[PDB]
């Protein structure tokens, strides 16, 4: 017997057009969140060329149309040159991110007066999100305090950075936070059989210490999101490996597998993978949008998910029971028991819909 | 015609007793100072043992005594391990101190997680000061607003961290700073001349902007404190060359020449130099002390000062106008004309002086 869930989403995915199309497209990378239960992704701008400006994001949001599976919406990535520049067209995007650690030349932000100037200029109503590792975290959030506004960090991984967040919840500061399935369920002990380049991942892999204070303090965590991220088996096993782990197919496997064994509930899921991504980024309901799940199906995780065309997964060898049978969405079959049945293009931009855009002051 | 300035504050001195008494020891960086113009110096804590426990600061203390030939106040170091431990003897110290960035095994902390420890566990009215560079500024600035209370930051050397102290200060943070004359007066456009070596500093030096913008931002500044860091040549100029750069003989010529060009008032200085000091870290005043500038005398920094064992200087060839002629500390002339005439142990702990306690509730 199956269990209906809401049509999930995910706030973080890598979908690398343009640009990156080897990696995964946006028809390649929506299947693999209808194969994961996902209906609706959050795309990062991270793509070449980086979506930093209007041009960008208009062909950007083209290619998602042409492209695009499920439904999305598309962020804006802050740089070095568009702070104060993208009013005309901040309403139209997921939100806007802030890459506060490595990052390439495009995205890298040089001095927290230019985070400042990013938390002054952008609308004070729309989302901003943050790759913010360790002392970034406090950091960030010292920003978000002297312009009194919201910020919403992406991947915590740590638990120095779990009872920061809470910490900051206590007080009754505006913040929000996101954990990726790697960060809940490997750790420094499976890096032995990743090796190096595969392993290779930002946030990286924490201890066991970090990953259990994750699941003692699942209270502080709002969402779950995949931080899909793909890159090839090629790149991650050459001699300069990228970081990330592919995670679309794999997400709701692991957590319904850990919903079976107790170790949260289904509404816990629900919250993260349903209402709070909606309630934080101001995403509209899908009509006619449901998930069937089988929760008895035992499997092993293969070598590879069959849609992500990273071709490999971190999780290999896992095993997880859960699996998902039956995807609709907006009233049609996208998904069945392996197959995806809705083609590249059904997908549309939920900001365009009129119960998409964020509410404003006039 | 001299002019009478009062007994100057250094609240950033390394004097490296114990341990490392080859760079420097009490005696000879006390000579510094008086010939400087400072009359009382705060001792940071990163010594051979690191000052970290009781146990260490009793011995720093004896040393101190019998040693400085100045007035001075020992800081305690924050580490890993003591944070609630150092209750009792917390009021004897200048302040705690917190190294954020680099540091050594011993003052090394891993997570934001302890900074905040020792926040909420040191005594609330007593000093903290920070070793915070860059984004490490705001993230402590957080953690400051977290336990509600103030934080000092260490030798501000960036556009970047000047412009984020002002943004606090115009929020009514309760965060003050200093800044380093080698933040002042030398910049990227001195590491040709200086070298590799002999350049390592921490903070780094900055661009001819990062210069440009202390100085314009000269009304968030203060204090000046000399971060006064002696290592030997052979060491700047070995393998593997340790940061630091000593100062404590030529932060005031520097500053006496900035004076006489109109750069900053000498009411600038002494706000900076003195008042500030003591209102800060609640020094007492040192009665019958005071020091004697001529403001007109030219000379070229040598490749030496006199006093400091460091036995060499990062401002070596620099023009100034002014020099210290004559020191009086507590009814004793300390200093004449190149000539230190209190012995070493003249100098007392300030902080067992009635007066310099730190007032607290009961
Ligand atoms: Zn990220
Ligand atoms: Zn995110
Ligand atoms: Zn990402
Ligand atoms: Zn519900
Ligand atoms: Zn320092
Ligand atoms: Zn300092
Ligand atoms: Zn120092
Ligand atoms: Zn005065």
């Given at each position: 017997?199956?269990?209906?869930?809401?049509?999930?989403?995910?706030?973080?995915?890598?979908?690398?057009?343009?640009?990156?199309?080897?990696?995964?497209?946006?028809?390649?990378?929506?299947?693999?969140?209808?194969?994961?239960?996902?209906?609706?992704?959050?795309?990062?701008?991270?793509?070449?060329?980086?979506?930093?400006?209007?041009?960008?994001?208009?062909?950007?949001?083209?290619?998602?149309?042409?492209?695009?599976?499920?439904?999305?919406?598309?962020?804006?990535?802050?740089?070095?040159?568009?702070?104060?520049?993208?009013?005309?067209?901040?309403?139209?995007?997921?939100?806007?991110?802030?890459?506060?650690?490595?990052?390439?030349?495009?995205?890298?932000?040089?001095?927290?007066?230019?985070?400042?100037?990013?938390?002054?200029?952008?609308?004070?109503?729309?989302?901003?999100?943050?790759?913010?590792?360790?002392?970034?975290?406090?950091?960030?959030?010292?920003?978000?305090?002297?312009?009194?506004?919201?910020?919403?960090?992406?991947?915590?991984?740590?638990?120095?950075?779990?009872?920061?967040?809470?910490?900051?919840?206590?007080?009754?500061?505006?913040?929000?936070?996101?954990?990726?399935?790697?960060?809940?369920?490997?750790?420094?002990?499976?890096?032995?059989?990743?090796?190096?380049?595969?392993?290779?991942?930002?946030?990286?892999?924490?201890?066991?210490?970090?990953?259990?204070?994750?699941?003692?303090?699942?209270?502080?965590?709002?969402?779950?999101?995949?931080?899909?991220?793909?890159?090839?088996?090629?790149?991650?096993?050459?001699?300069?490996?990228?970081?990330?782990?592919?995670?679309?197919?794999?997400?709701?496997?692991?957590?319904?597998?850990?919903?079976?064994?107790?170790?949260?509930?289904?509404?816990?899921?629900?919250?993260?993978?349903?209402?709070?991504?909606?309630?934080?980024?101001?995403?509209?309901?899908?009509?006619?949008?449901?998930?069937?799940?089988?929760?008895?199906?035992?499997?092993?995780?293969?070598?590879?998910?069959?849609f992500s065309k990273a071709h490999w997964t971190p999780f290999e060898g896992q095993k997880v029971k859960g699996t998902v049978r039956r995807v609709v969405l907006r009233g049609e079959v996208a998904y069945i028991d392996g197959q995806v049945l809705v083609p590249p293009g059904y997908?549309?931009?939920?900001?365009?819909?009129?119960?998409?855009?964020?509410?404003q002051l006039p």
């Open positions: 017997k199956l269990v209906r869930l809401p049509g999930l989403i995910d706030v973080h995915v890598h979908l690398r057009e343009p640009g990156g199309t080897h990696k995964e497209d946006f028809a390649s990378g929506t299947a693999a969140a209808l194969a994961g239960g996902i209906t609706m992704v959050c795309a990062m701008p991270n793509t070449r060329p980086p979506i930093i400006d209007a041009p960008a994001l208009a062909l950007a949001q083209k290619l998602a149309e042409a492209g695009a599976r499920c439904d999305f919406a598309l962020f804006l990535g802050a740089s070095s040159e568009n702070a104060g520049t993208l009013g005309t067209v901040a309403g139209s995007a997921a939100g806007l991110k802030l890459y506060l650690n490595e990052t390439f030349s495009e995205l890298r932000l040089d001095s927290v007066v230019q985070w400042m100037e990013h938390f002054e200029t952008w609308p004070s109503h729309l989302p901003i999100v943050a790759h913010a590792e360790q002392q970034t975290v406090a950091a960030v959030l010292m920003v978000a305090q002297l312009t009194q506004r919201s910020v919403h960090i992406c991947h915590v991984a740590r638990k120095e950075e779990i009872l920061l967040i809470k910490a900051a919840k206590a007080r009754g500061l505006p913040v929000t936070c996101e954990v990726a399935p790697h960060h809940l369920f490997l750790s420094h002990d499976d890096l032995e059989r990743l090796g190096p380049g595969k392993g290779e991942v930002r946030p990286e892999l924490g201890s066991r210490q970090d990953v259990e204070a994750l699941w003692e303090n699942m209270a502080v965590i709002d969402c779950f999101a995949s931080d899909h991220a793909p890159h090839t088996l090629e790149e991650k096993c050459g001699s300069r490996p990228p970081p990330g782990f592919p995670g679309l197919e794999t997400m709701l496997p692991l957590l319904l597998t850990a919903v079976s064994e107790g170790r949260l509930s289904l509404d816990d899921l629900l919250q993260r993978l349903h209402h709070n991504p909606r309630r934080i980024f101001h995403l509209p309901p899908q009509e006619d949008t449901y998930v069937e799940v089988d929760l008895e199906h035992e499997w092993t995780i293969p070598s590879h998910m069959p997908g549309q931009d939920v900001r365009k819909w009129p119960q998409g855009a964020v509410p």
